[PDB]
Design a protein around this ligand. Structure first.
Ligand SMILES: *[C]C1=C([C])[C]=C2C(=[C]1)N([C][C]([O])[C]([O])[C]([O])[C]OP([O])(=O)OP([O])(=O)O[C][C]1O[C](N3[C]=NC4=C3N=[C]N=C4[N])[C]([O])[C]1[O])C1=NC(=O)[N]C(=O)C1=N2[C]/[C]=[C]/N([C])[C]C1=[C][C]=[C]O1
Ligand SMILES: *[C]C1=C([C])[C]=C2C(=[C]1)N([C][C]([O])[C]([O])[C]([O])[C]OP([O])(=O)OP([O])(=O)O[C][C]1O[C](N3[C]=NC4=C3N=[C]N=C4[N])[C]([O])[C]1[O])C1=NC(=O)[N]C(=O)C1=N2[C]/[C]=[C]/N([C])[C]C1=[C][C]=[C]O1
Lengths: 494, 499
């Protein structure tokens, strides 16, 4: 019934908000729609897999807030297997390579590839993390799709296809669906191209021992009966003295403040009184989430390591169900597995198949790419299609179509009276990730602390010391990488 | 509590569905979120305006379903004033003209203008009304915004600026926001460029005497207590034998079938058990509605008629708050008024201002455009920002961003068990209009009549006899219009000759 703060949503962001508020002495309730906590993180346990992350999973250097919070809850990380060679599959053949970036041998293509990545980071350096709509060329970039940008930038098919897979993999959407401004902001606010695509020294360096769902589970352990499972919020009333929040199962909660820790578009599932201000009312219909099936195939052994393959596969082309894989073996070398993502339009298309039919296609792909019959002999399979989720709306995150970020972006974290906004979408560093969820939960919580007079305005946004366990190495470029010309730049010299 | 069919939404579509179902003997309930029916039509009544349409208003030839419904309910239409000259205001100057299209004197520019409209209709013929994603080039066109399409087509800035204004005005959205496939579909399923833009012989020919709000109000009168105002639906349960529909004020309704007659994205406001299938679940997060403020400025007299202007203005300019106006004077000649639309990003921008500052900017614009100081003497002002409506989401309608219509389009009107889908967005002819509302409402109702074994399958889709009161002149082209070359076509002709 009555409390200081109602938090809507028990994902990482809501749980981190509620934990902070509770630790500071306020009475908090968390209202969660599902029969579990975690949201877009979900750890399945069974004897065959032991545990497996079917939702968010990877963490890495510079994500110091998720690392600190998990550490305090008694979680530990291990490193994703990247000891052996990566594979680029292109035109029906496997090219093994080392390093984050698949190599290119033709000199024209080389220039084109080099220029494309470098140009993404140049454009990023003009986009403010906390206000992408203030970029000098904000409207121009916002009014093009990433498909247009790539059509302008990439003078070769090879670069255009690799840059396309890069978009698909990062934001689970087609290049033609997304704003160029938003995608460039996204990459940049993750620390740039190298940091976002790298396993070693990047976002995919690590996983949590036991699963990432333990983060939310253990915060729910700390809050006891303050978390209400199967309480979907349907109505928020701000007209009266205290804020009133009603659930689907008929309960009424009453508080001074609310934190909305749900994806923006999921705001639509709530009837507000008074109506939302105009800009928010429309923003929340303009911001879908992407489409992904996360798929994990289990094998008796990590047989790929015998051939000096780490298990990472970058797979070009329309026919491949999966464009990107990582080794999902446990740190002990057991429960051998390959993780793959069926991305964007391939998720819409392959979801009509059965579970077994998807297994077969994956097994056959992997056998081709890894060049082993061992890939045809899986011992177990697990998958999750996030598009079918009523209370996520997709995965990994919310994407912005052309024109939206400049028109409505300012409203995302703007308080509506006594509702403050959390969720990974409202973050400024690794928004879209578990790290962003923590940043935004803790920030929304601290905005409420300040509206209550408990902390000054300068403590709303707090910096995070670097993890000692997962230190960050700097991102370096070579001299040639910085100064080799683009394709049209080599033409102007001729 | 118990009925045969719960209709969610009491706009034209919901009210047309309910009426048909009622007229066939079934027990229906209409559950409407607001304290009124009509939805995106709303007729305001006070002594200063008598009546005024702040939402949907215009009807015209080929929109035979809304004309039959309104006529059966006792309503009349009248002709929007187009006796005197239209104005095209471009680069700070007004160019009076007659006919539907602003004319063009520079021959190069003339070629580009003729080709643009012609290619809109040409691409249109490739696109089936009932299945736009079946166009041979659906994918290619859907992965392109209307801004990209215009950048390819228009070799003159003049044609590109006119085309941009045409998109903004038709779909209340920027060229860079909307799919080219969707937009070409939307224009074709209204009968083409000419039909869509015209007053005389087009979409804007007429209005209803007393306002379009009476359509919904009269159906509510026929239905009596079957219409429940202030019952926003929060929850639909299909796991049991009868379908369970719950409202925000804690009432429960039970039915064999449900028609959802709300904008697709407002389907988000309902919690579903079991969950919606994947494709609908994501589609309803991908389909926003446009942005528009409709504004009416009243004057003592329709002073523009005296300078031989009908009061239609096509106003190109970033500075112009309004890009299109019409004479909104009563058929009797009194309550003289200019209606104007504030479109897309200007609705966003100018909503910051007060009512009085918006009035001031409109009057000043109209003064310049009409060359008339009288325009600075309004007697009254009415307006509505549709963007702030929780139970509409915007106006006029739903637009599809790039990539959405080919991936999700096929599910807009796919039944989900015993839920069936109405709303003008599900129509095949004048989707986005009051006409499409009636088509979709009636089609969804007849879908349920078929599931119940009361009519055969071929009676679900039913054609409509032509209005004898608002008959349609066919759309014609001249030989020159059809065969004059494009700008690149003339340039190809040149390179070939000089060889
Ligand atoms: C799904 C997914 C996948 C499959 C994958 C991934 C992901 C995902 N990610 C992301 C994450 O997960 C996120 O970000 C997070 O989680 C977020 O969180 P938040 O913010 O908290 O949110 P959520 O979770 O959703 O929560 C919410 C909640 O709420 C609720 N609700 C709703 N509604 C409502 C409610 N309640 C009450 N009422 C109402 N109405 C719900 O239920 C929930 O609970 C990720 N991340 C990270 O970090 N990592 C990872 O890994 C991930 N993943 C992925 C990634 C990928 N990548 C990166 C790609 C690549 C590779 C290479 C390069 O790139
Ligand atoms: C808004 C507007 C404006 C401003 C203008 C216009 C329009 C609009 N339009 C359109 C119309 O209006 C529409 O279409 C209709 O109305 C629709 O119908 P429906 O489908 O029925 O839908 P609605 O109305 O929305 O209704 C729905 C209902 O539901 C409810 N809900 C929600 N949610 C819920 C509910 N309930 C319960 N529960 C829940 N949850 C609500 O409340 C409602 O009631 C139009 N149309 C026509 O026809 N005409 C006209 O005029 C119009 N307008 C416009 C147009 C213009 N133009 C076209 C111009 C031009 C020129 C050149 C080119 O263009």
């Amino acid at each position: 019934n009555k409390c200081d703060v109602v938090v809507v949503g028990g994902g990482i962001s809501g749980m981190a908000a509620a934990k902070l508020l509770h630790d500071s002495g306020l009475n908090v309730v968390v209202l969660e729609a599902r029969d579990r906590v975690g949201g877009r993180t979900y750890t399945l346990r069974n004897q065959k897999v032991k545990y497996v992350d079917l939702g968010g999973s990877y963490v890495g250097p510079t994500q110091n807030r998720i690392l600190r919070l998990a550490k305090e809850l008694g979680l530990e990380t291990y490193k994703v297997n990247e000891v052996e060679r990566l594979i680029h599959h292109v035109k029906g053949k496997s090219y093994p390579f080392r390093g984050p970036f698949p190599p290119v041998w033709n000199p024209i293509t080389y220039l084109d590839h080099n220029n494309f990545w470098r140009t993404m980071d140049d454009m990023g350096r003009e986009i403010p993390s906390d206000a992408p709509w203030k970029a000098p060329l904000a409207e121009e970039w916002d009014n093009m799709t990433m498909k247009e940008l790539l059509d302008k930038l990439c003078w070769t098919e090879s670069a255009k296809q690799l840059a396309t897979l890069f978009v698909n993999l990062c934001v689970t959407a087609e290049t033609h669906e997304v704003s160029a401004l938003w995608f460039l902001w996204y990459v940049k606010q993750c620390g740039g191209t190298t940091r976002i695509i790298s396993t070693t020294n990047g976002g995919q360096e690590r996983k949590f021992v036991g699963g990432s769902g333990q983060v939310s589970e253990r915060i729910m352990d700390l809050l006891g009966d303050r978390v209400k499972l199967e309480r979907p919020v349907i109505y928020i009333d701000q007209t009266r003295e205290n804020v009133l929040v009603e659930t689907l199962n008929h309960e009424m909660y009453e508080a001074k403040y609310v934190i909305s820790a749900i994806p923006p578009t999921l705001g639509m599932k709530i009837h507000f009184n008074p109506p939302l201000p105009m800009m928010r009312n429309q923003m929340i219909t303009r911001v879908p989430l992407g489409s992904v099936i996360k798929c994990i195939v289990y094998y008796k052994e990590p047989f790929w390591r015998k051939k000096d393959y780490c298990g990472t596969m970058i797979i070009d082309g329309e026919e491949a169900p999966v464009a990107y894989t990582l080794d999902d073996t446990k740190p002990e070398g057991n429960y051998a597995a390959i993780m793959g993502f069926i991305l964007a339009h391939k998720a819409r298309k392959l979801a009509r198949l059965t579970k077994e039919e998807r297994l077969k296609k994956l097994c056959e792909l992997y056998a081709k790419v890894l060049g082993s019959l061992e890939a045809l002999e899986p011992v177990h399979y697990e998958e999750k299609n996030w598009c079918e989720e009523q209370y996520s709306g997709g995965c990994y995150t919310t994407y912005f179509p052309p024109g939206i970020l400049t028109q409505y972006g300012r409203v995302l974290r703007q308080p509506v009276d006594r509702i403050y906004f959390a969720g990974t979408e409202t973050a400024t560093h690794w928004s879209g990730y578990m790290e962003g969820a923590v940043e935004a939960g803790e920030r929304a919580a601290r905005e409420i602390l300040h509206a209550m007079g408990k902390i000054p305005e300068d403590e709303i946004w707090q910096s995070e010391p670097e993890s000692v366990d997962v230190p960050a190495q700097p991102i370096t470029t070579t001299f040639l990488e910085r100064h080799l010309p683009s394709v049209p730049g080599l033409l102007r010299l001729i």
